[PDB]
Ligand SMILES: Nc1ncnc2c1ncn2[C@@H]1O[C@H](COP(=O)(O)OP(=O)(O)OP(=O)(O)O)[C@@H](O)[C@H]1O
């Protein structure tokens with residue numbers, strides 16, 4: 001029972017909200033009848049974090065503040081302000097038996113409150129709608145806090161602990177903050193003179209811009225850079241699980257389920273980069289590094305480039321075994337060159353060897369041009385793994401899986417990924433196939449023995 005004039009005002013309000021706009025008239029009338037119009041004064045907690053919850057809210061008037069405490073002995077973090085037409089309180093009805101944040105009225109507020117049963121019977125659910133309607137405010141809030149913390153650091157705040165590795169143009173040291181000894185990072189130190197002489201000034205500029213601007217759990221973070229008279233310093237996330245190439249060399253080859261977890265980490269890093277118009281171009285096992293948990297991340301962005309949408313790039317680059325045919329033939333390429341590399345990766349992880357391999361680069365390129373159908377697949381490759389490999393390594397870039405109508409979803413929805421927990425991977429709750437042994441924040445035992453904006 002609801003007054004007719006008020007029942008019609010809610011119906012009109014619910015139609016104005018895009019989320020609920022497409023519901024049938026009879027549902028909108030049931031919602032308009034079952035809802036409760038609750039008013040709140042400025043300062044009132046609509047929801048308290050930690051409390052039990054069984055109601056969903058749609059703001060019909062005013063604004064609210066959303067905050068969240070990480071630890072009890074920690075500062076509540078501001079996440080976001082919500083206003084008229086926004087909604088909240090669905091997380092405790094969809095997997096948490098607990099409110100995950102506080103919602104405080106920031107002026108005179110009115111919410112249309114819906115019970116858990118009505119939320120499921122009438123609205124259905126927002127498991128697919130809350131992920132897309134709202135962006136990750138917790139990630140944004142963390143990046144803002146991290147950006148302030150890192151902006152206030154100097155080269156004098158660090159101690160060198162050990163060496164993670166030495167590349168062709170610089171050494172990666174494990175560094176630690178003097179004040180917070182538990183907080184370690186990977187510091188890449190590059191000689192300025194060496195960058196000029198090897199003609200890598202643009203490659204270093206691009207690598208900093210892309211890595212520093214990238215915020216993904218499947219991509220090694222570049223927190224910031226420093227610079228002095230002779231060197232450039234790149235403060236990165238320390239991934240102490242080791243390089244995937246050494247783990248592969250040791251085990252010989254990875255089982256189907258192991259390979260699947262690592263390929264999914266790459267699919268997530270590519271879904272992220274490709275949504276920003278960035279091409280990676282250097283996928284290979286030596287560019288995948290495990291953090292202390294066993295989660296794989298992309299680490300080298302020397303060939304990566306922001307190319308935008310619907311346009312190709314022309315530079316020859318990559319590792320001979322992983323380079324796509326249109327790159328070999330210098331005919332221009334786009335993000336679909338990355339999906340070709342993913343097929344190569346799957347094949348190398350499952351067998352220990354890449355599909356196309358000659359004694360030198362020129363022979364390898366010739367073998368790549370004959371295509372994936374001239375390669376004898378070992379019987380240990382599962383039929384669904386082989387099928388995805390062959391759909392990724394199509395000679396015609398236009399036909400590659402990942403580059404069709406639904407983009408990266410087509411890869412994610414392939415038969416090989418049936419029963420793979422993509423949300424658990426994105427949340428970090430999925431158990432990795434290889435658990436690394438990391439004795440402390442200083443354990444490097446899993447590793448073997450133009451500059452104005454820097
Ligand atoms: N963020 C990181 N955390 C932990 N170890 C890292 C990190 N970044 C790099 N490393 C390690 O340090 C090594 C040093 O290599 P670097 O990044 O200088 O180039 P590279 O991999 O040798 O490539 P190239 O010689 O082709 O330019 C890496 O191979 C890896 O073992």
Ligand SMILES: Nc1nc2c(ncn2[C@@H]2O[C@@H]3COP(=O)(O)O[C@H]3[C@H]2O)c(=O)[nH]1
Nearest residue numbers: 079088089090091092099100101137138
């Ligand atoms: N945890 C969380 N909740 C948020 C955020 N932004 C809005 N909210 C809403 O705040 C609500 C608090 O109660 P719930 O945990 O049930 O559901 C939560 C979300 O609907 C956010 O960034 N994180």
